[PDB]
């Protein structure tokens, strides 16, 4: 309705890291243990205050199954921010971060803000990716970093708040 | 990208009529009693080889929640087809059809192909909307008509095939 800006932010990362739940957690405060992730591409909006300004954060997610030219273009088109997500309890998903970074470099707009997100922090008892290793990688590649839990909500609001503030 | 044509078809109608399940049926022949409907807007693609050609039917669905210019325009933009859905066991969802037809009128392309769909035909013992009446309304408005059951699959693939044939 009435707002100041509209920013599109896309979620990327291995399937199963919790992208659909970061989306639902942030935009509707909903979480599902048994995934209700999109079968294709999905986006939902959340209005949030940033520096007094009302921003409509339109968050995108995908199963990544469909990759024909048209859909891949539509996904990144206009995106001013990207949350590159991995699962702190699954090292493989972090090992794939390098590839997702290249993906963004090959399809995203040049001015896109990227933030590395280690999701499922509530599973720290089974941690597979040391916070320090991920943070160091984040710094060396010039991008913000934070660990979240869509499950218990820790840092979810902060994560989007941060990337949105970096874009504005 | 190796198809011949890309047709965008949108699903509209009251929430709870079964749109997310028509989408899951059309794309993966799957049905969920426990709704996995999108929380905002989502689209998935179904590939079908017809006339030696290969067509990608990009089906869109909506939660109907988010309602702000930007997204409303993007929803109908480029759509060559529309499935206007109601629940045959809930008379109110049928009453709203006329109002849904109005939204297509001033938001969708004038030449968009519209098919009226009476879903949940498996709940015949709870029917609230007589078939002949719905069909008469469709007839008078120049709309195709069919009753489906995303739950037991009846006429779902046929409804899809019908509108695509009308669009192609
Ligand atoms: N423990 C835990 N599970 C999570 C978290 N976020 C998502 N999940 C779960 O992990 C699975 C995969 O999540 P899904 O959201 O479908 O992620 P996607 O495939 O990346 O989009 C589901 O079982 C979720 O309930 C989280 O922060 N903590
Ligand atoms: N009996 C019956 N239930 C259905 C049918 N299609 C969908 N449903 C159910 O009715 C509810 C509403 O469906 P949902 O797909 O989320 O429709 P939406 O809100 O229009 O997008 C869900 O519990 C579905 O499982 C159908 O053909 N028959």
From Swiss-Prot, chains A, B:
Keywords: Acetylation, Cell cycle, Cell membrane, Cytoplasmic vesicle, Endosome, Glycoprotein, Golgi apparatus, GTP-binding, Hydrolase, Lipoprotein, Membrane, Methylation, Nucleotide-binding, Prenylation, Protein transport, Transport. One of its GO terms (molecular function) is syntaxin binding. It is found in: Cell membrane; Endosome membrane; Recycling endosome membrane; Cleavage furrow. GO terms for biological process: amyloid-beta clearance by transcytosis; astral microtubule organization; early endosome to recycling endosome transport; establishment of protein localization to membrane; establishment of protein localization to organelle; establishment of vesicle localization; exocytosis; exosomal secretion. Changing residue 8 to N: Abolishes SH3BP5-mediated guanine nucleotide exchange. Its EC number is 3.6.5.2. It catalyses: GTP + H2O = GDP + phosphate + H(+). A motif (Switch 1) lies at residues 31-42. A motif (Switch 2) lies at residues 62-81. (Microbial infection) Glycosylated on arginine residues by S.typhimurium protein Ssek3. Mg(2+) binds at residues 20, 38, 61. Its cofactor is Mg(2+). It is a lipid-anchor. Changing residue 33 to P: Nearly abolishes SH3BP5-mediated guanine nucleotide exchange. It comes from the Eukaryota. Changing residue 20 to N: Dominant-negative mutant (GDP-bound form). Induces increased number of binucleated cells, indicating defects in cytokinesis. Inhibits the transport of NPC1L1 to the plama membrane. GTP binds at residues 15-21, 32-33, 35, 37-38, 64, 119-120, 122, 150-151. GO terms for cellular component: centriole; centrosome; cleavage furrow; cytoplasmic vesicle; cytoplasmic vesicle membrane; cytosol; endocytic vesicle membrane; extracellular exosome. Regulated by guanine nucleotide exchange factors (GEFs) which promote the exchange of bound GDP for free GTP. Regulated by GTPase activating proteins (GAPs) which increase the GTP hydrolysis activity. Inhibited by GDP dissociation inhibitors (GDIs) which prevent Rab-GDP dissociation. Changing residue 17 to M: Impairs protein folding. The keyword Protein transport applies. Belongs to the small GTPase superfamily. Rab family. Switch 1, switch 2 and the interswitch regions are characteristic of Rab GTPases and mediate the interactions with Rab downstream effectors. The switch regions undergo conformational changes upon nucleotide binding which drives interaction with specific sets of effector proteins, with most effectors only binding to GTP-bound Rab. Interacts (GTP-bound form) with RAB11FIPs (via their C-termini) including RAB11FIP1, RAB11FIP2, RAB11FIP3, RAB11FIP4 and RAB11FIP5 effectors. Interacts with RAB11FIP5 and STXBP6. Interacts with SGSM1, SGSM2 and SGSM3. Interacts with EXOC6 in a GTP-dependent manner. Forms a complex with RAB11FIP3 and dynein intermediate chain DYNC1LI1; the interaction between RAB11A1 and RAB11FIP3 is direct; the complex regulates endocytic trafficking. Interacts with EVI5; EVI5 and RAB11FIP3 may be mutually exclusive and compete for binding RAB11A. Interacts with STXBP6. Interacts with VIPAS39. The small GTPases Rab are key regulators of intracellular membrane trafficking, from the formation of transport vesicles to their fusion with membranes. Rabs cycle between an inactive GDP-bound form and an active GTP-bound form that is able to recruit to membranes different set of downstream effectors directly responsible for vesicle formation, movement, tethering and fusion. The small Rab GTPase RAB11A regulates endocytic recycling. This is Ras-related protein Rab-11A. The gene is RAB11A. The chain holds residues 6 to 173 of 216 of the full protein.
């Amino acid at each position: 309705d009435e707002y100041d800006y509209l920013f599109k932010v896309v979620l990327i990362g291995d399937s199963g890291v919790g992208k659909s739940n970061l989306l639902s957690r942030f935009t509707r405060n909903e979480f599902n243990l048994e995934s209700k992730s999109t079968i294709g591409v999905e986006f939902a909006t959340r209005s949030i205050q940033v520096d007094g300004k009302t921003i409509k954060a339109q968050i995108w997610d995908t199963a990544g199954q469909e990759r024909y030219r048209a859909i891949t273009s539509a996904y990144y088109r206009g995106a001013v921010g990207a949350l590159l997500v991995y699962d702190i309890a699954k090292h493989l998903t972090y090992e794939n971060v390098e590839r997702w970074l290249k993906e963004l470099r090959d399809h995203a707009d040049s001015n896109i803000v990227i933030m590395l997100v280690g999701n499922k922090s509530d599973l720290r008892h089974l941690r597979a990716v040391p916070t320090d290793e991920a943070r160091a990688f984040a710094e060396k590649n010039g991008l913000s970093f934070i660990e979240t839990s869509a499950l218990d909500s820790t840092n979810v609001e902060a994560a989007f708040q941060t990337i949105l503030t970096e874009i504005y």
